[PDB]
């Protein structure tokens, strides 16, 4: 599954649910969930946070590292454990319904990224 | 089966093929793969000029194949980007024979191997 019962998305970077494709869609849906521009704050730049960022931007949201509408907490250990704030069990259900064709923006409608 | 213009560049509207997130991911994956296999550089590096949807989508693919990226300069391969309505991507060093090799990988039905875990590259702002 994408989200644990505790409400987190975890795994080994590169393996589902942390594939570039799925992380990209998680990001698309997160921005969409907030629109239906939004801003995501990530703690660091790595494969996982960046794949999530590209999707968030593709949907018209902007991301920064240092904090906006949604903030990502990440703990890198045996596995990666991601937590979004704020995201209730309701937000998570809304998300799950979107992920399971999420529209995308193009050209200048695409969000930005700031280191 | 090609994306490079007769001028040795890739052009398009961000979000529209060949500049979709999916395709850019694949371009990044293929570029890194080309450097590891053809140039025999085990951990190639890509330098991007700035951070936006196109350069980052490209970076994710590059890292997924085992390469590392930095914003600035110094890498084995460096990206030159012209923005605007139609983005224009140029890589250096990328010869015409390199472009053919790259496209062969991009349009090939053969899967482009992906690395995982500790083997995925890093990103430096």
Swiss-Prot record, chain A:
Q: What protein does this entry describe? A: Uncharacterized protein aq_1627
């Amino acid at each position: 599954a994408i989200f644990t019962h505790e409400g987190k998305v975890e795994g080994v970077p590169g393996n589902y649910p942390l594939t570039a494709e799925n992380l990209f869609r998680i990001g698309l849906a997160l921005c969409t969930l907030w629109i239906l521009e939004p801003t995501l704050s990530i703690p660091e730049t790595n494969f996982v946070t960046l794949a999530l960022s590209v999707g968030f931007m593709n949907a018209g949201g902007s991301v920064n590292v240092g904090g906006g509408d949604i903030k990502l907490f990440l703990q890198k250990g045996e596995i990666y454990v991601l937590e979004f704030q704020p995201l209730s069990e309701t937000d998570i259900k809304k998300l799950e319904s979107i992920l399971f064709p999420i529209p995308k923006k193009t050209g200048e409608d695409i969000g930005s990224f700031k280191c």
